[PDB]
Write a protein that binds this ligand. Structure first.
Ligand SMILES: CCCCCCCCCCCCCCCCCC(=O)OC[C@H](COP(=O)([O-])OCC(O)COP(=O)([O-])OC[C@@H](COC(=O)CCCCCCCCCCCCCCCCC)OC(=O)CCCCCCCCCCCCCCCCC)OC(=O)CCCCCCCCCCCCCCCCC
Ligand SMILES: CCCCCCCCCCCCCCCCCC(=O)OC[C@H](COP(=O)([O-])OCC(O)COP(=O)([O-])OC[C@@H](COC(=O)CCCCCCCCCCCCCCCCC)OC(=O)CCCCCCCCCCCCCCCCC)OC(=O)CCCCCCCCCCCCCCCCC
Ligand SMILES: COC1=C(OC)C(=O)C(C/C=C(/C)CC/C=C(/C)CC/C=C(/C)CC/C=C(\C)CC/C=C(\C)CC/C=C(\C)CC/C=C(/C)CC/C=C(/C)CC/C=C(/C)CCC=C(C)C)=C(C)C1=O
Ligand SMILES: COC1=C(OC)C(=O)C(C/C=C(/C)CC/C=C(/C)CC/C=C(/C)CC/C=C(\C)CC/C=C(\C)CC/C=C(\C)CC/C=C(/C)CC/C=C(/C)CC/C=C(/C)CCC=C(C)C)=C(C)C1=O
Ligand SMILES: CCCCCCCCCCCCCCCCC[C@@H](O)O[C@H](CO[C@H](O)CCCCCCCCCCCCCCC)COP(=O)(O)OCC[N+](C)(C)C
Ligand SMILES: CCCCCCCC/C=C\CCCCCCCC(=O)OC[C@H](COP(=O)(O)OCCN)OC(=O)CCCCCCC/C=C\CCCCCCCC
Ligand SMILES: CCCCCCCC/C=C\CCCCCCCC(=O)OC[C@H](COP(=O)(O)OCCN)OC(=O)CCCCCCC/C=C\CCCCCCCC
Ligand SMILES: CCCCCCCC/C=C\CCCCCCCC(=O)OC[C@H](COP(=O)(O)OCCN)OC(=O)CCCCCCC/C=C\CCCCCCCC
Ligand SMILES: CCCCCCCC/C=C\CCCCCCCC(=O)O[C@H](COC(=O)CCCCCCC/C=C/CCCCCCCC)COP(=O)(O)OCCN
Ligand SMILES: CCCCCCCCCCC1=C(C)C(=O)C(OC)=C(OC)C1=O
Ligand code: SF4
Ligand code: SF4
Ligand code: SF4
Lengths: 96, 171, 176, 115, 156, 215, 70, 318
């Protein structure tokens, strides 16, 4: 079952838009998982879902690189999430 | 003079080079140091005093000391061996110039060389701290709070009244 | 009814004595502890990837305070000062007067967030659902003064978080 | 020759690390900062006061038992002698007395710390 | 200029090193320290950010005032704050430490730890959640990233 | 000090490492709660009991609510009492986890702390779902509880409870039979039943010496 | 994951490889490529000194065979 | 060219220590259901560099009551001795080939304790003094048993030369002949490196920081590097002593690789042990070493003196 995990890693590499996208998501979030896209903000944040992860890892956001006035390629924080996706992300509701 | 000054700390810092270089052995220089709290309180009182608007004040201490005796007292309070030697003005100016090349805060400068060995002027025509309600704090009462940091472990607990205050040239 | 915790005797047969001697000389329970730690080593960790992943919360969660509006935009607050009276930490300061149109409205509504205990007593006491504790908890500051909220700050918080606040209230108002 | 160079290199590297650590960063030393630490408060007494040693007897025995090692370390070379019976007898004799010395101090309560 | 670029890059390196290795003192006072423990727990795992508790103040970079500071305790907090070598940072956590909180009018409570030590980050809550404390720590990291000590020295 | 719980100044006289005298100095966390309560209504004074023992919050809420109800001569409804007992047992679990794991940390077994604080986090999720606050819930009030349980809470509590036993088993596997743990704990701090009764002890400090007592 | 611990272990293993490999390569480079001679006793040192003397270039590792006996 | 070899020894050892810190943090994290450093660089590979740069750009402080000369000397001695311990190790060739390498390592290890003692005394603080006295007690506990265990194990080697241990284990590991001595030696090395469950001198739960509580910044970092280098060196020495890797004279890289994996496994075993157990009391450590380890060690010394004579298996090279 080793070849299975190696192929899943290769699929994660290929599913992020190539090697450059893989390193982008590796250095921007320290996480290279691939999930189902749920939606996108008007500010650029992308929201993904994977119900096979345990409670806490089944929902996550990929933050935008440029919010209202600042460059957020490296400087991201939890306060950049808009209220509706804040409610969805913290599992206060099951509906995006 | 105070905890973060460059006057007592500066003299105290001179122990590292072994001997204390003094121009004319500090026998031709008179100093009248003033406490930091006295100056700050004088500024505060000058703000609140309506008569102090367009005046000029001189803030000086209660005692005048020869530089040699002042440095000797400083080393005595810090319990460090005092080894004063005379150094010519040109040589010690050269030392100051050599120290001036530091890109960081210089340990000393030629300007410091000049100012240390200049006697403090006497200006009796100017109002002083006593005209702002302040009694000048003598150095012998506040020297320990600055120089106790410069002692070794063996003399840290020595009391303030142990170190025989220095001789004062009061007119 | 009760039970004893340390009232068992070891059997003194040669089998048990030899087993205990082997335990002493060969460190079997230490190996058992090592095995438990090794078992935990290969488990999936419980860490989440904050700030990209967040801990789960509830509609009842008490966060930053906010002042709400009616659907017409009118302020819900009527300066009844129930929240000020009930506030266990005396964190609310309220002043009021009749408005230019004769309405009962506040002129001062301050919450000292460094006095606050976030108990939610104020939103319980409010009769018009004007003051609430929002879902936001990420509002750390660099100076103390920024945590002294006036009426403008609370009204801006309400205007900014109303979309989530109304949905959270809709999910819990039947328990209140 | 090589070992002296190695020791000099190691000591020089350590001293240079100390020098870098002590001259590179910014220093702001004041009396409160450099004071002795006892978790919130000023010490009552001095750290140079006598500190009782409850294992003082085992410390003296360690001195005698450490020299047992000096007498036993040439054993690998002693196994190459022709009169193996004599060497084995004396080697076993030396360890037996070391075992008996431990047994004497154990049975006379010498291994228990002072109360 | 060349020197401006050099000092800017050196500032970048030093700030990255300092914010990527933040060691808070093992120091807590009340209810807030429980949430500090939970922020050290496996769910949040502050050690993955490079944040490790160290008992000795000499070996600590940050002080988190987590709990009520009483009058009897203030000299001890000031002592352990002073013994911290520089650069040092202070994070105030919880209402009690921020402004006195629910014991603000007490006779034996200091009305905020900023009367005793300078504060860099104020974390609100009673107690702030472990996630809120992690947010405050990351905000402190972002604030450290903005330091320009060597640029200021060069422009002197 | 890592073993002083933050606010304990223990002045000890030592001969070597033997402890000649223990003089605990307290008051480093005295906030004058009892005087502050006099300026509050009973409802306003309730949240102080959350912060009295911050590891067992709802238990202090229950004690204060029972005192106030006894003074009021009123009776809580049965469902409130059942919720109170359920959450008091959850709180006892939280408290015993904290006590055991911090104890093992002080001796040196630092690993079970991390294993058990995940369960503690789940129980904080239970508190937050029921009251909106993770630890200082203020759920138990004189007269009953503040709010009814949300739909689905009992199922999640059952799911947690049917698995907590294996976590206890893993802790007990790491500590109970270990000879280092026994050498550090067996015959340490032995107190007699008469001394425990006369010194004002209660709870486990009484039951450990053979006294059969539980309130 | 547990396999994310592996990169640090691999870096540490790469660091630990270097000393022995470098020592072997330096011994071969400075001893004619033939595994630097070991002299634990005086006879081996005598052999080394004789080898140095008869080499003609003051190097022990320069070995003279049967071609040096005309 | 010899200085090149000295550097190629010392610098990779420092890098290995730096990344051993990260390996410890991640391993203990994963045994505790967490991850450990994974943000500062990919998989936390940049964490040690950040730690070192932070530590060496932080202000070091001289305690007012401290004795300055010994205070500065102690970390220098610690780091220099930690670096020196590596020179006689055959991997498969040693930098310094000694007739008596094992006893040299014994003497240097015995000298290393004085760094801890002198730092604790010169700090002039109560906790540092308690740590130094605990170090005295620990050495008194382990020294004699460790030395006699080395004697008994090396009796089958025939000399004190470290490179002979490769020849001695050409067909079988020495452990298959002296595994009780191997277990006692493993525990003795755990005690010798001040590692859990015998990390008494630092005593973080009890003594806050112990002997190094006064130390800050760069001087503190050198103590840390010295301790971790000593851990790696002790595990490498144990691997040489009890797990003999086959050496091919024409391909020494195979021996180097085998050696490195074995010493890494032993270091991870220390890390696991730290993650698994509570801490001893420092009188209980001496009772364990003097009432259980010492009698078995004496008996096995007698047995290992007698065995080569009984079976006519005395090794060569008097
Ligand atoms: C050293 C041996 C390494 C062999 C190995 O990594 O396989 C472990 C693999 C781990 O299985 P598992 O974590 O129980 O399965 C969970 C899923 O596969 C979970 O798989 P996933 O969806 O998390 O996959 C993500 C993927 C991508 O992950 C990464 O690339 C990040 C980590 C890279 C590490 C390199 O991880 C990999 O497939 C690469 C594994 C390590 C490659 C090296 O199984 C084994 O090979 C066991 C070997 C015996 C161990 C004793
Ligand atoms: C012929 C003469 C012999 C030459 C002696 C060698 C050089 C040592 C003299 C300099 C140290 C004293 C400086 C000082 O007092 O404060 C510095 C200065 C002043 O501080 P302060 O707060 O203003 O005043 C402090 C008080 O005055 C007093 O503060 P204190 O409490 O620290 O005063 C104690 C200090 C004061 O020293 C004295 O009282 C007079 C100096 C005579 C000492 C000679 C006694 C013989 C000891 C055994 C022989 C050692 C070898 C000597 C032969 C040289 C050839 C190698 O005595 C010492 O601790 C020096 C001990 C040197 C032995 C180090 C050897 C390491 C042993 C490692 C294991 C060995 C393996 C087997 C081999 O502060 C600094 O600048 C920072 C620390 C700088 C110290 C650097 C490291 C110490 C010197 C390295 C030793 C040489 C190793 C090679
Ligand atoms: C208050 O301000 C000041 C500072 O700030 C805090 C200083 O650091 C400072 C300098 C700091 C000293 C401790 C420097 C001491 C180092 C000396 C250069 C040592 C003297 C010469 C050495 C190289 C020893 C070798 C002796 C000769 C052979 C040369 C001074 C002077 C100062 O006045
Ligand atoms: C239960 O909590 C705890 C932990 O768990 C989270 C720990 O990890 C832990 C151990 C301490 C850690 C935080 C590790 C700290 C890391 C070191 C101090 C950094 C040391 C690294 C450098 C000093 C090495 C030198 C750097 C160079 C790159 C090496 C090369 C040298 C050149 C000359 C080339 C402790 C004490 C702890 O208490
Ligand atoms: C050789 C021995 C002597 C020198 C000793 C030092 C050894 C060299 C130092 C190693 C440098 C590595 C540091 C670079 C890591 C930066 C990682 C990156 O993330 O930085 C970003 C940008 O980089 C930084 O701005 C600056 C880093 C680089 C600094 C400039 C290079 C200077 C090198 C000069 C070398 C000279 C050394 C001294 C010689 C005497 C900021 O992102 P960040 O906010 O963190 O992460 C957000 C967290 N998220 C992703 C989870 C959301
Ligand atoms: C073994 C592991 C680490 C190895 C050790 C080497 C680490 C190399 C890291 C180099 C990073 C650059 C160092 C920058 C920090 C230096 C200390 C510092 O921040 O002081 C700032 C100080 C503030 O002074 P002021 O603004 O005037 O006064 C304000 C207070 N009244 O400004 C300075 O002094 C800047 C001086 C330039 C620093 C020199 C750096 C050059 C690189 C040397 C590295 C040595 C390698 C060996
Ligand atoms: C860079 C310029 C170099 C100047 C060197 C001066 C050294 C000195 O004494 O100064 C003290 C200096 C800095 O203190 P401050 O003056 O307060 O701060 C400086 C910043 N303004 O302190 C130090 O760094 C001392 C460093 C020790 C020097 C190295 C010599 C020690 C030798 C150790 C020998 C012992 C070896 C033991 C092991 C060997 C056994 C086999
Ligand atoms: C410090 C303790 C010094 C111990 C050094 C031991 C080094 C060692 O064992 O190497 C042995 C090696 C070879 O011995 P064999 O095993 O027989 O093999 C070669 C024969 N074919 O012997 C040598 O090379 C001798 C070299 C000179 C000895 C070095 C002396 C070191 C003394 C340290 C003094 C420190 C400097 C002076 C001041 C000290 C304090 C300020
Ligand atoms: C035919 C002729 C054969 C000749 C004789 C050979 C037969 C020998 C049979 C017996 C050998 C036993 C060897 C074990 C030696 C010590 C055993 C021991 O009893 O020690 C323990 C204590 O030892 C320990 O428990 C260890 C404590 C530290 C634990 C650290 C981690 C545990 C080790 C992890 C795995 C070990 C792997 C070691 C080998 C690694 C590879 C080199 C005793 O302590 P107590 O139970 O408290 O009893 C004292 C009062 N009666
Ligand atoms: C290693 C596990 C993480 C420990 C985190 C450090 C905790 C610092 C707070 C001090 C403290 C401790 C230790 C503690 O145990 C405790 O409970 C009695 C407190 O009361 C809230 C404390 O404040
Ligand atoms: S939540 Fe409680 S403490 Fe905060 S303002 Fe409302 S009533 Fe006052
Ligand atoms: S917020 Fe609500 S309770 Fe407070 S004064 Fe306004 S209407 Fe009354
Ligand atoms: S702020 Fe609240 S939770 Fe924190 S210590 Fe004070 S009362 Fe306890």
């Amino acid at each position: 079952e080793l070849v299975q995990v190696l192929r899943r890693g290769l699929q994660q590499v290929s599913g992020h838009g190539g090697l450059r996208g893989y390193l982008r998501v590796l250095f921007r979030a320290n996480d290279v998982r691939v999930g189902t896209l749920v939606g996108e903000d008007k500010y650029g944040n992308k929201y993904y879902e994977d119900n096979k992860q345990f409670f806490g890892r089944h929902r996550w956001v990929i933050y935008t690189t440029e919010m209202n006035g600042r460059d957020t390629f490296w400087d991201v924080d939890g306060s950049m999430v808009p209220p509706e996706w804040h409610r969805w992300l913290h599992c206060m509701t099951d509906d995006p | 003079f105070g905890r973060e000054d460059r006057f007592l700390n500066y003299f105290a810092s001179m122990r590292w080079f072994g001997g204390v270089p003094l121009i004319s052995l500090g026998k031709e220089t008179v100093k009248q140091p003033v406490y930091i709290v006295d100056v700050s309180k004088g500024i505060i009182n000058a703000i609140k005093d309506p008569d102090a608007k367009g005046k000029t004040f001189a803030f000086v201490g209660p005692n005048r000391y020869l530089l040699f005796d002042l440095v000797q007292y400083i080393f005595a309070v810090a319990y460090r061996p005092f080894l004063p030697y005379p150094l010519p003005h040109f040589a010690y100016r050269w030392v100051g110039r050599l120290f001036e090349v530091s890109p960081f805060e210089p340990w000393t400068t030629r300007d410091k060389v000049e100012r240390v060995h200049m006697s403090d002027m006497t200006l009796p025509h100017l109002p002083g701290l006593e005209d702002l309600g302040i009694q000048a704090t003598p150095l012998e009462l506040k020297a320990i709070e600055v120089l106790r940091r410069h002692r070794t472990y063996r003399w840290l607990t020595s009391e303030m009244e142990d170190v025989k205050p220095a001789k004062t040239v009061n007119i | 009814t009760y039970k004893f915790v340390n009232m068992r005797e070891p059997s003194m047969d040669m089998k048990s004595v030899t087993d205990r001697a082997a335990q002493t000389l060969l460190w079997t329970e230490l190996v058992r502890g090592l095995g438990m730690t090794l078992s935990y080593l290969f488990r999936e960790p419980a860490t989440i990837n904050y700030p990209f992943e967040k801990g789960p919360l509830s509609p009842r969660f008490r966060g930053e305070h906010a002042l709400r509006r009616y659907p017409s935009g009118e302020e819900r607050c009527i300066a009844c000062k129930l929240c000020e009276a009930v506030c266990p930490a005396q964190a609310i300061t309220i002043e009021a007067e009749p408005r230019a149109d004769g309405s009962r409205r506040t002129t001062r509504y301050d919450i000292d967030m460094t006095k606050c205990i976030y108990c939610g007593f104020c939103q319980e006491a409010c009769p018009v659902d004007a003051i609430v504790e929002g879902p936001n908890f990420e509002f750390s500051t660099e100076t103390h003064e920024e945590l002294l909220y006036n009426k403008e700050k609370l009204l801006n918080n309400g205007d900014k978080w109303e979309a989530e606040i109304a949905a959270n209230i809709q999910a819990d108002y039947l328990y209140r | 020759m090589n070992i002296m160079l190695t020791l000099l290199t190691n000591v020089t590297l350590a001293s240079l690390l100390v020098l870098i650590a002590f001259w590179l960063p910014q220093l702001n030393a004041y009396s409160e900062k450099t004071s002795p630490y006892e978790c919130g408060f000023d010490p009552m007494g001095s750290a140079r006061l006598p500190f009782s040693m409850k294992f003082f007897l085992v410390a003296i025995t360690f001195l005698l038992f450490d020299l047992e090692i000096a007498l036993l370390l040439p054993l690998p070379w002693a196994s190459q002698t022709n009169n193996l019976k004599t060497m084995l007898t004396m080697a076993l004799f030396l360890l037996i007395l070391l075992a008996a010395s431990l047994a004497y101090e154990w049975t006379q309560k010498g291994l228990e710390w002072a109360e | 200029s060349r020197g401006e670029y050099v000092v800017a890059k050196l500032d970048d390196l030093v700030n990255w090193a300092r914010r990527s290795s933040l060691w808070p003192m093992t120091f807590g006072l009340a209810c807030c320290a429980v949430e500090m423990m939970h922020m050290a727990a496996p769910r949040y795992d502050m050690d993955r950010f490079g944040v490790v508790f160290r008992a000795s103040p000499r070996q600590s970079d940050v002080m988190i005032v987590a709990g009520t500071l009483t009058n009897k305790m203030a000299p001890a907090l000031r002592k352990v704050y002073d013994q911290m070598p520089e650069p040092r940072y202070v994070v105030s956590m919880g209402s009690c430490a921020n402004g006195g909180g629910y014991y603000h009018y007490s006779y034996s409570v200091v009305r905020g730890c900023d009367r005793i030590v300078p504060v860099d980050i104020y974390v609100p809550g009673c107690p702030p959640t472990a996630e809120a404390l992690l947010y405050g720590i990351l905000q402190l990291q972002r604030k450290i990233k903005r330091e320009k000590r060597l640029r200021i020295w060069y422009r002197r | 000090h890592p073993a002083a719980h933050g606010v304990l100044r223990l002045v000890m006289e030592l001969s070597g490492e033997m402890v000649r005298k223990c003089d605990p100095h307290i008051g480093l966390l005295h906030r004058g709660t009892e005087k502050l309560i006099e300026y509050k209504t009973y409802l306003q004074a309730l949240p102080y009991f959350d912060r009295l023992d911050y590891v067992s919050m709802m238990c202090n809420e229950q004690a204060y609510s029972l005192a106030v109800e006894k003074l009021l001569n009123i009776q809580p409804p049965p469902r409130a009492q059942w919720i109170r007992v359920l959450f008091g047992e959850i709180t006892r679990l939280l408290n015993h986890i904290m006590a055991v794991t911090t104890h093992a940390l002080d001796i040196g077994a630092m690993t079970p702390f991390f294993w058990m604080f995940e369960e503690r986090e789940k129980m904080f999720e239970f508190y937050e779902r029921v009251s909106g606050a993770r630890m200082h819930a203020a759920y138990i009030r004189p007269g009953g509880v503040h709010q009814d349980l949300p739909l689905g809470l009992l199922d999640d509590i059952y799911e947690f409870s049917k698995n907590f036993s294996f976590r206890i088993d893993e802790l007990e596997e790491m500590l109970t039979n270990n000879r280092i743990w026994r050498n550090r704990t067996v015959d340490i701090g032995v107190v007699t039943a008469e001394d425990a009764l006369n010194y004002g002890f209660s709870g486990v400090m009484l039951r450990g010496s053979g006294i059969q007592w539980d309130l | 994951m547990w396999f994310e611990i592996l990169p640090g272990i691999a870096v540490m293993a790469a660091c630990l490889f270097i000393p022995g490999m470098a020592t072997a390569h330096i011994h071969k480079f400075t001893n004619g490529g033939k595994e630097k001679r070991v002299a634990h006793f005086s006879y081996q040192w005598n052999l080394m000194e004789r080898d140095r003397r008869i080499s003609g270039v003051n190097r022990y590792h320069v070995t003279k065979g049967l071609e040096n006996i005309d | 060219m010899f200085m090149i070899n000295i550097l190629s020894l010392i610098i990779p050892i420092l890098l290995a220590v730096a990344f051993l810190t990260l390996v410890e943090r991640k391993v203990l994290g994963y045994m505790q259901l967490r991850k450990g450093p994974n943000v500062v660089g990919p998989y936390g590979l940049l964490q040690p560099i950040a730690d070192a740069l932070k530590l060496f750009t932080k202000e070091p402080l001289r305690p007012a009551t401290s004795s300055i000369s010994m205070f500065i000397i102690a970390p220098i001695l610690a780091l220099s001795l930690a670096l020196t311990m590596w020179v006689p190790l055959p991997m498969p060739y040693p930098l310094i080939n000694m007739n008596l390498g094992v006893l040299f390592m014994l003497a240097m290890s015995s000298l290393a304790v004085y760094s801890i003692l002198w730092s604790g005394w010169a700090s002039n603080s109560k906790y540092a003094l308690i740590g130094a006295l605990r170090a005295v007690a620990q050495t008194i506990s382990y020294e004699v048993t460790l030395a006699i265990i080395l004697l008994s194990v090396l009796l089958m080697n025939g000399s004190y030369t470290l490179s002979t241990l490769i020849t001695t284990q050409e067909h079988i590991w020495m452990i298959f002949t002296s595994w009780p001595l191997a277990m006692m030696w493993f525990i003795s090395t755990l005690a010798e490196t001040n590692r859990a469950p015998f990390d008494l001198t630092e005593g973080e739960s009890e003594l806050v920081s112990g002997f190094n509580v006064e130390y800050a910044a760069g001087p503190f970092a050198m103590f840390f590097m010295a301790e971790y280098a000593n851990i790696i060196m002790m595990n490498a020495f144990t691997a040489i002593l009890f797990l003999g890797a086959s050496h091919d004279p024409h391909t020494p890289e195979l021996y180097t690789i085998n050696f490195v994996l074995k010493t890494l496994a032993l270091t991870i075993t220390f890390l696991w042990i730290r993650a698994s157990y509570p801490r001893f009391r420092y009188d209980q450590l001496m009772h364990l070493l003097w009432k259980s380890f010492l009698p078995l060690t004496l008996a096995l010394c007698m047995w290992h003196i007698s065995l080569p004579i009984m079976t006519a298996s005395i090794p060569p090279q008097s």
